Amino acid sequence: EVQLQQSGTVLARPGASVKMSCEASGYTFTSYWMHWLKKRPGQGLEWIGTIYPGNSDSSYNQRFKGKAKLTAVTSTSTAYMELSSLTNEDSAVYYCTRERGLYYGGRSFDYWGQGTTLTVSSAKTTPPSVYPLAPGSNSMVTLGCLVKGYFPEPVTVTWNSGSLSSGVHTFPAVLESDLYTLSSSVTVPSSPRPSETVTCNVAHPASSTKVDKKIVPRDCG
Amino acid sequence: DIQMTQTTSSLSASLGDRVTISCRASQDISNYLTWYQQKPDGTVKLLIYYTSKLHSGVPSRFSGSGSGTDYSLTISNLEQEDVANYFCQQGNSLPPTFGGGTKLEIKRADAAPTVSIFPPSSEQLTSGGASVVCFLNNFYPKDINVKWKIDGSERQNGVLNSWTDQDSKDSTYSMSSTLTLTKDEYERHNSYTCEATHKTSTSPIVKSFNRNEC
Numbered sequence: 001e002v003q004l005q006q007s008g009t010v011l012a013r014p015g016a017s018v019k020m021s022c023e024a025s026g027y028t029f030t031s032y033w034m035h036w037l038k039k040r041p042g043q044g045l046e047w048i049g050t051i052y053p054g055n056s057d058s059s060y061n062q063r064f065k066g067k068a069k070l071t072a073v074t075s076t077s078t079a080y081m082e083l084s085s086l087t088n089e090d091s092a093v094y095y096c097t098r099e100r101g102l103y104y105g106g107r108s109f110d111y112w113g114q115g116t117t118l119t120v121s122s123a124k125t126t127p128p129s130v131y132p133l134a135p136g137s138n139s140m141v142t143l144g145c146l147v148k149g150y151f152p153e154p155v156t157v158t159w160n161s162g163s164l165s166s167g168v169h170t171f172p173a174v175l176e177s178d179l180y181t182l183s184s185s186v187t188v189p190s191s192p193r194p195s196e197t198v199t200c201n202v203a204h205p206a207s208s209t210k211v212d213k214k215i216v217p218r219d220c221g
Numbered sequence: 222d223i224q225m226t227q228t229t230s231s232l233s234a235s236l237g238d239r240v241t242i243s244c245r246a247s248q249d250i251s252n253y254l255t256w257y258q259q260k261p262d263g264t265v266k267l268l269i270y271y272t273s274k275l276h277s278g279v280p281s282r283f284s285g286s287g288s289g290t291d292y293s294l295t296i297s298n299l300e301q302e303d304v305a306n307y308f309c310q311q312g313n314s315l316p317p318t319f320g321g322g323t324k325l326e327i328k329r330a331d332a333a334p335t336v337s338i339f340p341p342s343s344e345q346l347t348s349g350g351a352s353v354v355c356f357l358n359n360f361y362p363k364d365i366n367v368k369w370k371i372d373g374s375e376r377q378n379g380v381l382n383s384w385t386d387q388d389s390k391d392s393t394y395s396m397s398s399t400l401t402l403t404k405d406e407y408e409r410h411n412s413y414t415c416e417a418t419h420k421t422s423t424s425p426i427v428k429s430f431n432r433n434e435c
């Protein structure tokens with residue numbers, strides 16, 4: 001089974017340089033052309049370049065020439081890509097892939113890595129603020145959990161430590177002035193809460209943050 | 222570069238149906254077209270190369286055809302495991318170029334959105350900001366429009382929306398609409414409304430509250 005395994009997410013400020021790897025297995029590394037691709041949310045999939053680990057012969061997209069350097073180490077069957085002078089446009093998910101065709105390749109890419117995320121940002125590691133979303137007076141009732149102003153991704157939200165899986169919606173994060181924000185909803189019957197405790201648990205690994213915001217009905221009168 | 226287009230970004234079908242994904246090139250690519258499958262996993266797999274040649278390990282219900290600029294991928298008997306994003310590439314000219322992809326969604330009965338609105342917490346106001354969050358959960362089709370009304374008037378500034386992918390469990394969609402402003406501005410208005418337009422309702426589904434209650 002041909003398998004590529006790329007390196008983890010990379011955070012970098014503008015002007016920095018980074019290096020991501022791609023470890024191949026299940027075949028002879030030196031005998032197939034490797035390629036790198038860039039997936040940015042606005043564009044389609046873009047071609048960076050390619051290297052033949054046999055003799056390190058390479059070819060580059062003219063747009064990434066001087067931006068991306070490509071290397072391959074025969075010893076550890078590992079391809080590398082270097083990215084220099086990072087800017088906001090360099091933010092993307094980068095894929096390494098193998099070209100079909102022994103020795104001389106073909107016109108397709110027959111095996112793929114899972115991808116590597118590169119986040120270009122000057123934002124500092126910031127814990128999330130977590131806010132209870134209570135109703136404001138049916139068989140069911142929906143509660144919420146607002147997670148605001150954190151960096152970087154990811155954040156993890158659960159309800160009653162995960163004991164509430166069904167009826168949960170957690171939405172993709174969005175960027176507002178260099179920080180991330182999202183919300184999570186949970187629907188339970190109208191039976192078990194105001195009466196039983198409902199609690200959202202927000203975790204932010206990067207900052208080592210764990211907060212539990214118990215949902216309690218609004219204070220008015 | 223040769224440009225690859227996939228006019229249909231999302232396609233509706235049912236399990237067991239015949240599905241056809243379309244691909245177009247900005248010029249003749251001489252049958253040098255290749256198809257890929259990107260599952261929710263984020264994993265990519267090769268299916269078909271050179272217009273119609275099956276890659277080893279690919280099920281036979283997959284097939285491809287086309288010539289000149291127009292090409293297509295076909296699935297004879299759609300299974301739940303075939304629900305993914307399908308995109309093409311031309312291999313006629315370097316650099317290789319790809320289409321935006323076509324994401325498969327599963328058909329189901331029209332379901333109205335469950336709309337819920339939430340005034341900002343008192344805890345949040347101590348920060349200086351004020352987020353009015355509106356959930357619209359478990360609706361179908363995906364087509365939906367969300368409007369924020371303040372004291373009667375429409376509002377667009379400070380509104381960020383966020384959509385989930387199609388939930389496999391019930392084939393529905395959900396979205397959050399969040400309106401964010403200063404505490405000072407929030408405290409200077411009364412009626413905050415979140416109304417949704419959708420196929421299941423002639424009249425918009427309106428969810429609102431008056432700040433001056435709680």
Ligand SMILES: C=C[C@H]1CN2CC[C@H]1C[C@H]2[C@H](O)c1ccnc2ccc(OC)cc12
Pocket residue numbers: 033050059099104105106107108109311312313314315316317
């Ligand atoms: C990019 C450079 C190398 C990678 N492949 C092997 C040697 C070099 C050529 C290319 C392939 O033969 C090839 C030839 C001609 N037209 C092509 C068009 C697309 C393509 O995508 C994999 C590969 C092509």
